[PDB]
């Protein structure tokens, strides 16, 4: 007859060893360092920080190395690590006006105060595979202009001064924190922005692309995309006064969106907002576009696309949840499958009879 044996634990251990060996790869090649990933794969690091929830470049690069380059796995690793960290403080609200700029562009005006700073970007590159990278090369010597940074007012501050757009006013409302309480639909805009920042880049990009193609359009213009170093400050209880704890490289995107004509005020442009860690800006743009799409209840807009369906967008945006639940089908399901089989075999035997 048959006797049951124990095979689960050793199979698990062998599978983990196989995965670790595959991660190391050929041993003749030197092992990758987290520093190399942080420096040279910086955009993947940016995505992993933004979605995993920690603005620590080294940790995100470590997760990428551990995940064998899998962005979803690295993001989940970073989020799991976040769970183990004590919250020491809450930052004072970020002031993007103080950003030291690496890149500042505006699509709405040819030239603006402070100028069109392209900065480090792949924009306008010819996407031809560069086979010289197959071998070691020499980094180019950078041209140097004047060192001063020109006054860079937010383009939306220029639009609002003309009455074309409305200033974003602070009423002192306490932001919702979906990391402490589960989201409740309909969610506040603070909760929506927090979720979108953690949301999958591809999902939100597809939703925004759909909005551009008529599935809940909002007539977007890139009013300003700002990337640079923004200082973080906290008010520790031991001292009672603000202390600057460092700077973070972040990208801010502001979208002008289709004007509205309210009954009691002049017609004005609407707007969307995106904010991400690092330089990767398409995530911020998609965040702004989906934020504007989800603003439909505020503006009484009739939904014409899934991007405006708040629950559908947000409940499936976090790739931690989505990847976990899709991959969970790999788990043994033979008890549930036996139940489905037990019924089908009967409905097959009752139809034939």
């Amino acid at each position: 007859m048959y006797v049951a044996v124990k095979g689960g634990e050793k199979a698990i251990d062998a599978a983990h060893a196989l995965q670790e060996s595959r991660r190391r790869g050929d041993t003749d090649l030197p092992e990758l360092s987290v520093a190399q990933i942080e420096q040279q794969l910086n955009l993947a690091v940016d995505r992993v920080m933004t979605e995993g929830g920690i603005a620590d470049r080294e940790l995100a690069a470590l997760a990428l190395k551990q995940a064998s380059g899998d962005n979803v796995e690295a993001i989940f690793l970073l989020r799991a690590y976040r769970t183990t960290l004590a919250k020491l403080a809450v930052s004072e609200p970020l002031d993007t006006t103080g950003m030291r700029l690496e890149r500042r562009i505006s699509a709405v005006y040819k030239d603006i105060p402070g100028g069109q700073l392209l900065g480090p970007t792949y924009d306008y590159t010819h996407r031809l595979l560069d086979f010289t990278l197959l071998a070691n090369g020499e980094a180019p010597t950078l041209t140097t202009a004047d060192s001063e940074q020109q006054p860079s007012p937010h383009v939306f501050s220029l639009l609002a001064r003309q009455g074309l757009a409305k200033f974003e006013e602070d009423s002192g409302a306490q932001p919702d924190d979906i990391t402490r309480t589960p989201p409740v639909y309909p969610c506040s805009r603070s909760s929506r922005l927090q979720q979108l920042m953690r949301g999958d880049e591809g999902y939100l990009l597809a939703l925004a692309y759909s909005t551009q193609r008529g599935y809940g359009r909002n007539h977007p213009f890139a009013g300003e995309i700002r990337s640079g170093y923004i200082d973080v400050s906290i008010v520790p209880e031991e001292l009672g006064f603000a202390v600057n704890v460092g700077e973070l490289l972040m990208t801010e995107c502001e979208m002008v969106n289709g004007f509205i004509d309210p009954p009691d005020e002049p017609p004005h442009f609407t707007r969307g907002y995106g904010l991400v860690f690092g330089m990767s800006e398409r995530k911020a743009m998609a965040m702004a576009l989906v934020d504007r799409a989800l603003q439909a209840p505020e503006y009484g807009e009739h939904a014409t696309g899934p991007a405006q369906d708040e629950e559908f967008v947000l409940a499936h945006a976090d790739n931690v949840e989505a990847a976990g639940f899709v991959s969970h089908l790999k788990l043994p399901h033979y008890v549930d499958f036996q139940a489905e089989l037990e019924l089908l075999k009967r409905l097959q035997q009752e139809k034939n009879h």
């Binding site: 095979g7 799991a80 990391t179 589960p182 931690v320 008890v335 036996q338 139940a339 019924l343």
Partner: protein
Amino acid sequence: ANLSGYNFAYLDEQTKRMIRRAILKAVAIPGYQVPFGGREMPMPYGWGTGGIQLTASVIGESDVLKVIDQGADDTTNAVSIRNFFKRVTGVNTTERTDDATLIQTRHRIPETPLTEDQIIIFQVPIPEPLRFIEPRETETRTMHALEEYGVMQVKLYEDIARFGHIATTYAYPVKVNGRYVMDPSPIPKFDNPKMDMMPALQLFGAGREKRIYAVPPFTRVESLDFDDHPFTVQQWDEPCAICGSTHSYLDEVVLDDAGNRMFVCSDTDYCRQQSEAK
């Protein structure tokens, strides 16, 4: 003992306290899905994070932990969860349902009847029994609140009309304490009767969906059905090929491409208990 560098059971005291409050609220409101601020675990969402959190919040040094997946202690994920709990708590573990104080289970209730002071913790993908009828939480929350379960009865009636049977074979909805329609987790219809007037506390954890719900001991759990279509559990024409039991839930093991198969107990502990007794 715990010698891993993490807090006992890997949860910070604030998260444990919040989950404990949620557990008490769920016990006081049987069948109701209590939202809780679930955290991301070392296991991916959809791989038992809710059950892990519940066990971590309830478990103690003196508890004997039993972890089973598909009814088996040696299942991959059950092994992973048990090893994690051994690492971060050091508690004693057992494969015997009788000797367990805490049972964390995925998709099976043990064949061995549970006893007083035992807690069985279920891992739940979808805490909302009405989800597949109404995917939106905004509607199901109000349906729960106003006891509007008319959509489930219609679903059962239509299933009978279309097939002659109720299509649902696992995660079969059950009314709790005469009020709340509840999802018992993806356990088969075979196990649902065990829930009724059980002398053990039942806890249900949906980590990804951020819900916790519970059934107190000695609580009425009635599977939704009709008088002329009474609740019928899965049945097999063969007994277990190892122990010969005819009363256990059976898993089909395919032995070859020629179609030779054998049916064996999913509850491996019960299978061993029967085989040793001969």
